[PDB]
Design a protein around this ligand. Structure first.
Ligand SMILES: N[C@@H](CCCC[NH3+])C(=O)O
Ligand SMILES: N[C@@H](CCCC[NH3+])C(=O)O
Ligand SMILES: [Fe+3]
Length: 343
């Protein structure tokens, strides 16, 4: 067995970039925006017929691959060319993001999910939905917070929405700018190799999964030999109010001791790179940084602040139907491990 220790790196070609750009422009003209219900209803058809064939091939293989060799993450290097002057300055927070300008990017991202095949969704748990595409921008007000609006966060990893029974199946992180040169940290449950006694204890449904007395869940699930994972190191372990039992905390600490040595922080994304993640296999994180600066040869180089676009998707609308809005089967109303928001 070749135990995966790093994600698959795909170097996007100029011809592929040009196709994505032209297709993105055509979809903007045809449908106005990526949230158009006519576009969403025919998403897979546009994904398989408009994407560069190599991307379609990679994503289709990835969607059904839960084998021992699968890391659960793909880095698409140079997926898009970002014109930095046209993008202009990074807004102070995510509320300031111009969606007229990210519209083409939303089409491209939604086609990638569509080729898995997977359906872009939104969660009331994250920004009261906030649309299919989220701008992730470091806010000075929330500088050292354990969120996406954060800047100084270090050594931790998490799968997205570990507190939800219906968390995303697939995630995409499109980097518009990373002038601070912050590494993108990834962690795969497949990096452990063969099922061992430390991992086996995580199948027990005894762990707290606190929201971004509570119900418990298993950290490991799915296949017994090649499992899926729901994990949040900061929220389940290093949170004083996590409320874990001594048995559960001990199991998580033993797991974290093994897991932390397998974290991969080698990849530093460039503008236009997209990281595509199987949220059931691979956890993600970000190293500490001061937004709007980098240090080179003992000197501070001022720069525009970090800017990333996030899209989440589910492979089945049927199995999430008891937690979605009556008039919107793509809008998840789940609050915490089965419990729905009481509005
Ligand atoms: N910026 C995002 C990040 C949340 C997910 C990562 N903890 C938000 O405010 O919803
Ligand atoms: N969502 C992160 C950045 C993405 C890193 C994922 N490897 C943030 O706090 O901005
Ligand atoms: Fe996250």
């Amino acid at each position: 067995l070749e135990i995966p220790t790093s994600p698959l790196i795909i170097k996007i070609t100029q011809q592929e970039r040009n196709i994505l750009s032209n297709v993105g422009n055509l979809l903007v003209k045809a449908f106005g925006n990526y949230e158009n219900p006519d576009y969403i209803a025919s998403l897979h058809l546009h994904a398989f017929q408009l994407l560069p064939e190599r991307i379609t091939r990679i994503l289709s293989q990835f969607g059904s691959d839960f084998s021992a060799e699968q890391y659960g993450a793909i880095v698409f290097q140079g997926l898009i060319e970002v014109d930095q002057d046209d993008l202009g300055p990074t807004p102070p927070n995510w509320q300031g993001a111009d969606y007229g300008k990210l519209n083409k990017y939303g089409f491209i991202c939604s086609l990638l999910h569509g080729a898995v095949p997977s359906k872009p969704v939104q969660y009331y748990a994250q920004r009261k939905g906030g649309g299919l595409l989220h701008a992730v921008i470091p806010d000075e007000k929330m500088a050292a917070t354990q969120t996406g609006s954060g800047s100084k966060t270090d050594l931790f990893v998490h799968t997205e929405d570990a507190f939800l029974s219906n968390q995303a199946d697939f995630l995409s992180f499109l980097y518009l700018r990373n002038e601070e040169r912050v590494p993108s940290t990834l962690y795969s449950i497949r990096s452990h190799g063969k099922m061992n006694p430390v991992m086996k204890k995580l199948f027990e449904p005894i762990y707290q999964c606190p929201k971004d007395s509570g119900p418990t869940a298993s950290v490991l699930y799915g296949n017994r030999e090649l499992p899926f994972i729901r994990f949040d190191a900061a929220e389940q372990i290093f949170n004083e109010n996590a409320g874990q039992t001594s048995e559960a905390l001990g199991n998580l600490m033993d797991f974290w001791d093994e897991a932390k040595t397998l974290i991969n922080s080698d990849y530093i994304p460039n503008s236009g790179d997209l990281i595509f993640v199987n949220n059931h296999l691979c956890a993600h994180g970000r190293s500490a940084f001061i937004a709007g600066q980098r240090i080179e040869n003992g000197e501070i180089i001022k720069c525009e602040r970090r800017q990333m676009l996030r899209m989440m998707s589910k492979t089945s609308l049927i199995h999430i139907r008891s937690v979605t809005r009556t008039d919107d089967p793509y809008f998840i109303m789940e609050e915490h491990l089965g419990k729905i928001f009481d509005l």
